[PDB]
Amino acid sequence: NLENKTYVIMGIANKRSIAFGVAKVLDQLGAKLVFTYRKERSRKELEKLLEQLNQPEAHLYQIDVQSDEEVINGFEQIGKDVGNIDGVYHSIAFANMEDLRGRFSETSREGFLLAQDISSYSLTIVAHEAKKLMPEGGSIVATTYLGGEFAVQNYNVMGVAKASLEANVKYLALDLGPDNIRVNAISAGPIRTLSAKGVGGFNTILKEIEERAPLKRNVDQVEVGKTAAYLLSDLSSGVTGENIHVDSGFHAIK
Amino acid sequence: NLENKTYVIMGIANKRSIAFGVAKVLDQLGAKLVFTYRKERSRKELEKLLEQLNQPEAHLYQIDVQSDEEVINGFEQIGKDVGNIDGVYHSIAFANMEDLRGRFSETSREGFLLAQDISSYSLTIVAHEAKKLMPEGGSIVATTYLGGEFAVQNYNVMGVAKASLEANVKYLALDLGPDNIRVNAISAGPIRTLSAKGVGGFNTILKEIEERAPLKRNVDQVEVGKTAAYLLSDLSSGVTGENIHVDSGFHAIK
Amino acid sequence: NLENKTYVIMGIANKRSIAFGVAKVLDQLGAKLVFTYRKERSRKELEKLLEQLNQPEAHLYQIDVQSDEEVINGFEQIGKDVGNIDGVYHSIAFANMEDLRGRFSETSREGFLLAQDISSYSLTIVAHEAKKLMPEGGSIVATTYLGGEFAVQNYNVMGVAKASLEANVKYLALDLGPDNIRVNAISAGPIRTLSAKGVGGFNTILKEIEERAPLKRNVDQVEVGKTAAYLLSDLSSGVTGENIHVDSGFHAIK
Amino acid sequence: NLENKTYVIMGIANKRSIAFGVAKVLDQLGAKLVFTYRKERSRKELEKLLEQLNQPEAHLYQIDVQSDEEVINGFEQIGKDVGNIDGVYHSIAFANMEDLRGRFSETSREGFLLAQDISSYSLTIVAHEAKKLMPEGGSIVATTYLGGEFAVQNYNVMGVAKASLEANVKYLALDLGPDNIRVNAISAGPIRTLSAKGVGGFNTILKEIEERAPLKRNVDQVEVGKTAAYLLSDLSSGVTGENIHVDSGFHAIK
């Protein structure tokens, strides 16, 4: 039960976003949610989707995580509008198709670094600014994938950005631990989202989960949200620096 | 929210058992609990500890996991008495002191296999029998420690039994996944229990968590309990084959 | 260059055995070799295979690793016959077909412990006895499979026994390290051997390596033997408690 | 024996460099070596160092890996001067001292992207340019540290860059495996080098290996060079996507 709790959810674009699975769940557990977005199109989609939520106010902030000022100022504005928060859910990542859809060895410098910037470094600077609204401690959760841990066909530069994200979680864990800020990741299974369209062979990835994963079925966004609720709440008070695979068991097999 | 759920908890000896932290947690969440014990002295503690629970009936079964017949019969009687169950918490391990307290390379054959039998194999046969009471699916959780993944000073033969246990979890996950039974581990941080007195150096293991783990404190039985509730509930539906470290972040650092 | 080195190689059964690939390599590199076997039939193969090698003397010993007396007297005879040694290549596993070719949850207690005994515990007692003949230090290597790190269909009880072995290596590396005894594993890809016939679906496992492993081919016994030469020699002087995958890269992908 | 082999060694700074240990070993084994260096003002010192080797001529190229042009043009010149190569030892990394010595949460975007640039991305562009000189296959090795697998105090931004590097190696291995190019990492224990002065608490780190690693000693640059010889030669055919810890076993303990 997350009554009197407040969470910042970053990275909803539409109803299929993993972040929206998080939000339906936290919303049904009673949490007050605040939302961040990059594109105005996503804000419009948040205004719509909010009609399905209990949230009695829209708290929507534009934060492009590529800009120090937008992050610095977004979170500072949040602290002034709703006060102290209990956690962040980070569900942001990006890489160019042009790098994604070529040989990994052909990845461009700017594409590699763009993927690092949005997909990894964004969590560090969000943590630093969000720390400022958690004087009592809290919980930060980032969304990753099995491609950070193993080379997965066609995931390429985003795989290296995920490996980077996952180490980011650990180093943030050790750093903000003494402040009672826990930092963790959910390694979600593949899930048809707007961004899934960027991954070559994604239909064959889906199929292979069903055929080979222990539960012999794919996961959904609500399943990610149910584990986010665990990590973002007191239930997981002794868990930081961890990576939970919400993935039907597929991480455990070969 | 486990009203109308039933969980079999194996391995309570006294008030400081990890499994008793699992029990107070699931008891407060509204679960019906069934307890298994080995020694008569443990059943005596269980009858006492039940007075602190909300459980309106004592369901207590002697099950020494060295005995196929006792596991087989124990569980069949559980099903005759309370019907189908939603899960099992496994909190059972054993090795001889004489093996634990010598050089690992001096470990006896009989003591090595003893520690495999009670501390690993017992999971497999418990799953097999518990599966008969979970026709519609469920959740099995075992307790491990970090010495199953890395060589920890003085954990010796139990280290290899926990490596085995952790592989047992994954192979059980892949085998019983199709029946909608999930199987996971909790890697608990060090916690003062009756069995902790078996581990050479345990006070220095304690202190080292506090000074080096991200959270700079040790965990307790309730914290393991809260992660058990998550794992034993529908909040962790897409999660199987997993190993959650309830250990203040210690697994993540070096 | 391994002239004036002596290595004990355990577990050749015929020309296909992984250990005979190791032998050919160590033999081509100049090492003196001592062989142990279980079955009469394997001693006859050894006698025949020795004509293909450069060894001027045949040093063959019957050691059934289920017997402490055979391991203890085996290595002691070895000391009397050839003197101090530089290392041991261990290449021994067994599980019942009846357990392997059924569901893992259905594994018998005696089959599980049988598999631990031959396939894991054997390394501990071998290390203890070989250590007596390595007063200046040396190197011990064991043969593992990826299914000790992940659940692989049909590997079943042997996957739990390899998980046990792999931990065994790490605890022994720690225990014996001050004695300048290094202990490592090689995780070999699937290879056609007499024992590969016990694992259901082997050919499917072969094909999937060709299809999906980075090198898009299978490895062979000589490739394992060349990595053994590295681990058994001074080239690997800083390396212990390690698991080297000689599997065309299959361990790094998913 | 590496006669009629040619290797490019990137990252010799002085006689304490891990890349110079690599050079000594490979030089001793009869390889032709080519050296790359960052700044023209330290060509004269590198030339003096290499008088120690049995190289008949200096093959020295200035390549700063922050520039694609320098990498592209450097490897093209090497091809014209020397012909086809058999592999590359990558020993390059960099982070700001100013990001190294703060809270990891306080890392600047510029400093976090620079470390990724020099310490991870450089491997990718190097492999792409070196692959042009390895039409029949070959071997690429990069140097990482345990800090990329766990959070290590004071390693901060470099730890996340090594996590990146380590995934880089996995993705490169999958990409390039069909070309018969293998890509691996050596994870070196702590070694007193020019760059080690930049890590806070280095001697404490030394002392900890001495005290806690299985071998109870530190490793040296020549021990890295010997694992490098194995990884760069045919002894390691079948090994790719791998991370060999040359660290006295410290990685396997906790």
Ligand SMILES: NC(=O)c1ccc[n+]([C@@H]2O[C@H](COP(=O)([O-])OP(=O)(O)OC[C@H]3O[C@@H](n4cnc5c(N)ncnc54)[C@H](OP(=O)(O)O)[C@@H]3O)[C@@H](O)[C@H]2O)c1
């Ligand atoms: N779908 C899967 O199978 C899968 C699996 C595992 C992990 N994940 C991870 O889950 C997370 C979310 O992806 P998803 O599948 O839910 O896709 P999604 O619905 O497309 O969401 C991705 C979000 O990233 C945001 N974003 C990108 N760059 C940004 C920037 N510079 N500043 C602010 N926001 C930015 C997008 O916002 P705008 O549209 O407003 O630009 C969008 O809301 C990512 O971390 C992804 O890697 C996905």
Ligand SMILES: NC(=O)c1ccc[n+]([C@@H]2O[C@H](COP(=O)([O-])OP(=O)(O)OC[C@H]3O[C@@H](n4cnc5c(N)ncnc54)[C@H](OP(=O)(O)O)[C@@H]3O)[C@@H](O)[C@H]2O)c1
């Ligand atoms: N305490 C820690 O720091 C720690 C840390 C990580 C993981 N763990 C793990 O947590 C679990 C629980 O142990 P604990 O530390 O809570 O100690 P505990 O209170 O001493 O419980 C150990 C339990 O194991 C039971 N057991 C031993 N052999 C058995 C058998 N043959 N049949 C049935 N039960 C048997 C004992 O029952 P009887 O007394 O009736 O014989 C006792 O209930 C173990 O798996 C342990 O390895 C503990």
Ligand SMILES: NC(=O)c1ccc[n+]([C@@H]2O[C@H](COP(=O)([O-])OP(=O)(O)OC[C@H]3O[C@@H](n4cnc5c(N)ncnc54)[C@H](OP(=O)(O)O)[C@@H]3O)[C@@H](O)[C@H]2O)c1
């Ligand atoms: N083939 C693969 O795909 C593969 C892959 C990864 C790992 N491995 C591992 O590689 C090792 C060798 O297997 P292999 O494939 O080379 O098959 P193999 O030729 O059939 O050799 C297995 C050996 O185990 C010996 N052995 C079994 N029980 C023994 C006992 N109780 N005492 C002494 N020796 C005993 C057998 O000796 P006797 O015949 O005399 O009884 C036989 O020589 C094993 O550890 C295996 O698990 C194999």
Ligand SMILES: NC(=O)c1ccc[n+]([C@@H]2O[C@H](COP(=O)([O-])OP(=O)(O)OC[C@H]3O[C@@H](n4cnc5c(N)ncnc54)[C@H](OP(=O)(O)O)[C@@H]3O)[C@@H](O)[C@H]2O)c1
């Ligand atoms: N020392 C250790 O304990 C240790 C442990 C594990 C891993 N490692 C790794 O081993 C590798 C070598 O480090 P080291 O300890 O040998 O230190 P080092 O001798 O100082 O070598 C680092 C080298 O990287 C070069 N470099 C930095 N930026 C470059 C650039 N932009 N372009 C081309 N070269 C560049 C440096 O060149 P300049 O001198 O001209 O600036 C220097 O030659 C690094 O990857 C390091 O992370 C070191």
Ligand SMILES: CCc1cc(O)c(Oc2ccc([N+](=O)[O-])cc2Cl)cc1F
């Ligand atoms: C394969 C499962 C999977 C993993 C993901 O990280 C994923 O998310 C993204 C992938 C690529 C981009 N991009 O190109 O900007 C963006 C995102 Cl948010 C989607 C997935 F379907």
Ligand SMILES: CCc1cc(O)c(Oc2ccc([N+](=O)[O-])cc2Cl)cc1F
């Ligand atoms: C080091 C943290 C820790 C890990 C454990 O597995 C643990 O449990 C046991 C240890 C030894 C035995 N035995 O010898 O019978 C039994 C158990 Cl239940 C206690 C711990 F203190």
Ligand SMILES: CCc1cc(O)c(Oc2ccc([N+](=O)[O-])cc2Cl)cc1F
């Ligand atoms: C799948 C790759 C693979 C891994 C192995 O461990 C392997 O070795 C054995 C497998 C089964 C038994 N047995 O049942 O007695 C014995 C051995 Cl020696 C063979 C393999 F083909």
Ligand SMILES: CCc1cc(O)c(Oc2ccc([N+](=O)[O-])cc2Cl)cc1F
């Ligand atoms: C602590 C072990 C250790 C790991 C390393 O990667 C290492 O190398 C570097 C560290 C920092 C920088 N820098 O800030 O530019 C550069 C390098 Cl080359 C040295 C080490 F002493």
Ligand SMILES: N[C@@H](CCC(=O)O)C(=O)O
């Ligand atoms: N191969 C096509 C289709 C992928 C799919 O199977 O979903 C692509 O790269 O998008």
Ligand SMILES: N[C@@H](CCC(=O)O)C(=O)O
């Ligand atoms: N070293 C003592 C005491 C351990 C402790 O509690 O610190 C022992 O072997 O039990």
Ligand SMILES: N[C@@H](CCC(=O)O)C(=O)O
């Ligand atoms: N699947 C058959 C054939 C084995 C193989 O495919 O190699 C079996 O159970 O043995």
